[model samples]
Target chain A: HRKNGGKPDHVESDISYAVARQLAVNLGLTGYQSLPPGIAKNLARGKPLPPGIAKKTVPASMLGQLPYYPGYEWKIVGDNLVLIALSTAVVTAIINGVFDLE
Target chain B: GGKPDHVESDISYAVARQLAVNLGLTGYQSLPPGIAKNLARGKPLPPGIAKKTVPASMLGQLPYYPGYEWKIVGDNLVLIALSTAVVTAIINGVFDL
Candidate 1:
């Protein structure tokens, strides 16, 4: 998973894919398949990835009356997803690229 | 001392599932009234390959564990993760495959 755009801050898509892949392996998932082609291509060039999840507003009741619940809000913050996805992508890439059969 | 937790699924699938759930939930919140009304009528979106081309068979292949159901409620794909508490179930198949 190559870093995109040569940018210092923005998370690359390949990196994100790798992180997700690694997380899957850690969770005991098998089958070392390629990353989603869409995600892989996006990362190769450092293009911004599409939002994997959408935002939503949920009823307070749906939250089971949890204390300090922020009523309704944006469901998936893009920045947060990038962070997590990239983290996992890094681990996944290492496993697949360096050690495992490609 | 508590019940042991045995997990067989991979981490990637879980992450992908979480991402899918996020997409579904956000779609509901961010829905426009026209889109929502269209959903109420069960009218499909304008015939675009990306939106309309998805077949039921493809959806069936998606990793939706037992007891946890998902449906297109209006324009939104609604997934119930821990609905009836069947413990754990497989969420998603390989994205690559």
Candidate 2:
């Protein structure tokens, strides 16, 4: 069972990733320091993430826009650009802090 | 003829307006300052904008998040979200100083 009842009506991998990367980039521009350890770990290993993980592969145009810090590599799963991070914590933070979701 | 050729994408109006407000923008005219200005001047919109209107009220009922901006252009609604840099580039392209 999902926490928000059924699958969220607005949860698409690409859109989620787009939102996440922008949040991450904004954080970087405004001095958030770095990616959290668990997020780095998941990305580094390319491991399947936890239930709340939101991930997406980068599109061609978005290639160099996101902040790609040292340590983990940005992976390409087939043609899609994939970045891995905990969906629950990350998504929730974005929703509250930026998206203003209720 | 009044709109562009790009296919439209689904967007959530409530969330789009919410984002605008969150970004410190205002009104039912919820577009980035640059895009809004262009539309007002009868100038061309940025590329990839389709000629479709999503009712601001109806869109509010759908699921949405931040990272996108929703604008009401005449009778149509458009959603645009991109990286900070990319968006900056587009804004610059549309309204070069």
Candidate 3:
């Protein structure tokens, strides 16, 4: 029951990944850092987002531009788009390469 | 048109209606397309659209995802990706009276 028929979610961000990536590229969302290696290596779904890591707010111009899932919020964590739960900061989804691309 | 892939996994209208009926949802209007056009799987939700919480009573019967949450936007049952106010899924007209 834990892993029943799970479809690919962030493997492509609901097919919204490319769309969002292009938009970010056009808007010059550059200079953002990738997650620290120590945290990045350990990051996984179902675990709490470790505190003290830099989690940047999605910008107003760009925030409303990402997908909206209730009880979750978008944050920029080391050049990636992350969907985190409101109450616990658990990582629900991650779309790689959202920023600092040339 | 064939169903989009994101919606292929969304809750069915029948499932939505069951919760609607049990929760006594009534007489609510759906978001008009003029505004609804901004609602896409990856697009950020526009502000100024009013939203209501799905009562715990209603939430009790609906499915739960680790980080996704259900909300009421117009008469639709909407599942929003909380990280960025991105609308993950929507069930239209379940609250219509």
Candidate 4:
């Protein structure tokens, strides 16, 4: 749930695991986890993060690595990275299993 | 809702190159004529190939989702659906090492 009612300046039509991994690695991110079946089942495109969902922070080092789409922030939910709509917190695309800790 | 929704699976050239060089995946000479005559998507998974596990050194660089598995067939990065052995997607030249 967010107060900001903004959408992406540009929407990405596609994103892949390899590309997302490169992005996260550039950000020096680690210590992430694989998504549990419960959490993974709930993720889908064009949906909002349930108001009180568990999420992790993209560290200051790895935060900026999330490619900027404006109006969207890449969130770490479990080990997956999701580009979420700031206005509604709905997910645009979820980059699955790219932030796994080494 | 905008047109062209839902980001799908794909591999960037940069990541493709990384898979090859980082893993020493061999046999990048391209498949002989007719051997791969455009391994069509939405088709059955190809048979009689190495189908080796893409190691973490390289696998970590690709996105992996539930019910979908990533494997290296010869030198190509192949994506397969677990529910049914269907070719989800394919990117050749991972063995371009």
lDDT of each: 0.30, 0.33, 0.67, 0.62
lDDT of 3 by residue, B22-77 (tens): 77887777789898888666677789998788888776655555566778888888
The true-structure Cα RMSD of candidate 3 reads 16.5
lDDT agreement of model 1 with the native: 0.30
Quote the positional error of residue A59 for candidate 3 in Å: 1.2
Give model 1's docking category: incorrect
Superpose all Cα atoms of candidate 2 onto the true structure and report the RMSD in Å to 1 decimal: 16.5
TM-score of each: 0.21, 0.22, 0.44, 0.45
lDDT of 3 at B45: 76
Candidate 1, residue A102: Cα displacement in angstroms equals: 8.3
For A1-102, candidate 3 gives per-residue lDDT tens digits of 122213325322333454456557878886677778887646676666888876788877876555456777778888877777778988766667777666
lDDT of 1 by residue, A1-102 (tens): 222223212112323345534443454433433345554324321222345632223234422311121221212122121211232221111122211223
Regarding TM-score, does 2 or 4 come out ahead? 4
Candidate 1: chain B TM-score against the reference chain B? 0.27
Model 2 reproduces what portion of true contacts? 0.00
| Candidate number with the higher DockQ (3 or 4) | 4
- Chain B TM-scores, listed for every candidate in order, come to 0.27, 0.26, 0.80, 0.71
Badly placed stretches (over 4 Å) of model 2 are A1-6, A9-14, A17-61, A84-102, B1-97
- lDDT by residue for model 4 (B1-97), tens: 3222433322244355565776666755555556676455677665654567877776664554566667776567777777786776677676764
Which residue segments of model 3 deviate by more than 4 Å? A1-14, B1-97
